[PDB]
């Protein structure tokens, strides 16, 4: 779709692998924010998204947390705490026909800025200056959308660049989007390095005598410390007691 009418794709209840995309050697830019390009197949997320739009080469840098300009303030804005990975690559082979492809638009004029993760497909006449346009197009009244004009015979900064923006999100809710991790056996009564759905650490996983509510999965203590969790596979309550330590 266009930049001002990007399509948001919700991903949930599945296992997502990301190593096959980073090692594909086809994506030009694979910048990750908040996370790393590696060590992501061992984490589980709760709700991720996947945006898709086509911009030009000189505007790929504007799709980043903190960057500002024209395509990052009126069409698609990313938050400053965006925890995801921006994926873009050159596509000057099917999105640029002879003569000029005018199927991609970008919002050029807008009254105010754009809040992060917001879509606006309005096509009202931008009222510039002081004379009310009242719907007509003329002096001080410009159209909000403008065509790109993708021609195959252009520079590196005027070619189509399909951008995919993955918006990861990790919460305390039951995570669904996991990674390719081999589930091991639950070992108890010993201080071992456990690896849950995103709550890592070392401790003695024992049996607890508390009552977890059907909607509750994790647990915490009076000092904001996780002392009990719920098994992903089974429905048992495993109390996380700290490992043995002290002074000498």
């Amino acid at each position: 779709a266009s930049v001002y009418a990007w399509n948001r794709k919700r991903i949930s209840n599945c296992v997502a692998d990301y190593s096959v995309l980073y090692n594909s050697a086809s994506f030009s830019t694979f910048k990750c924010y908040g996370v790393s390009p590696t060590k992501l197949n061992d984490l589980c997320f709760t709700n991720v998204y996947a945006d898709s739009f086509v911009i030009r080469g000189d505007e790929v840098r504007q799709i980043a947390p903190g960057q500002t300009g024209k395509i990052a303030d009126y069409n698609y804005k990313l938050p400053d705490d965006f925890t995801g990975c921006v994926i873009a690559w050159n596509s000057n082979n099917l999105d640029s026909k002879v003569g000029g492809n005018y199927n991609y638009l970008y919002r050029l004029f807008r009254k105010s800025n754009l809040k992060p993760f917001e879509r606006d497909i309005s096509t009202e006449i931008y009222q510039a200056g002081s004379t009310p346009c009242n719907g007509v197009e003329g002096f001080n009244c410009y159209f909000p959308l403008q065509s790109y004009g993708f021609q195959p015979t252009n520079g590196v900064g005027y070619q189509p660049y399909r951008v995919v923006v993955l918006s990861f999100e990790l919460l305390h809710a039951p995570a669904t989007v996991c990674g390719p991790k081999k589930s091991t056996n639950l070992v108890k009564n010993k201080c071992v390095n456990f690896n849950f759905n995103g709550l890592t650490g070392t401790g003695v996983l024992t049996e607890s005598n508390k009552k977890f509510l059907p909607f509750q999965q994790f647990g915490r203590d009076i000092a904001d410390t996780t002392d009990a969790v719920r098994d992903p596979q089974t429905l048992e309550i495993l109390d996380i007691t700290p490992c043995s330590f002290g002074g000498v």
């Epitope: 005018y102 638009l105 346009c133 009242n134 007509v136 197009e137 159209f143 959308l145």
Partner: antibody, heavy 120, light 109 residues
Amino acid sequence: QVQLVQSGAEVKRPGSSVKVSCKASGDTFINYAFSWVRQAPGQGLEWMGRIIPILDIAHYAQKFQGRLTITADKSTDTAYMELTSLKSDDTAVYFCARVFRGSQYWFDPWGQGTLVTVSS
Amino acid sequence: EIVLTQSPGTLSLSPGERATLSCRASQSINNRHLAWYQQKRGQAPRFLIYGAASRATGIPDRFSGSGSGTDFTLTISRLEPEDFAVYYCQQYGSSPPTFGQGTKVEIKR
């Protein structure tokens, strides 16, 4: 500068469809919309519809929703107007107009007109 | 708003005298959205004035129009022999564009 060349007269048969073109020139085809207005003999003008090339949106009139299909090729700069299920009282001079890309517009640039006679 | 009726209809006037063409609307046009045209014999209409107040590109100052809410008037001062055609009205303040009837100015002999 801006010349909207149209086609010629079309001697069509009753109960059929026609296709009149409008060769646009002068400026860019995407920065200006196009509307077609017919003129019955001695009966004023009549706005049929309008298309937006940049948005590919074509909103017709209440009396043409279903029989009027206006297209526009953004490669050859030509606006097409097709009318299906033509009646006998359709011997109007169809004019081409290069309207703006707003909700309200005026038919400043005109063409030459095509006297398409349906009843033959 | 969707209705335009020409009051004169016909006007037998001599070249040189002022002309007055009216266009009555059913409802009121909010932002004086009215346009005037000039269609000669076997030709396309010519855009004359936008907004009923100012000429568009090169129309001389002889063609002038007044601004009102429900009834506009066109003043063709110093009428020339070449300015003998049919003039139409067009209200672009509503969603469906509507036209008028047409006033033909002929030579008075």
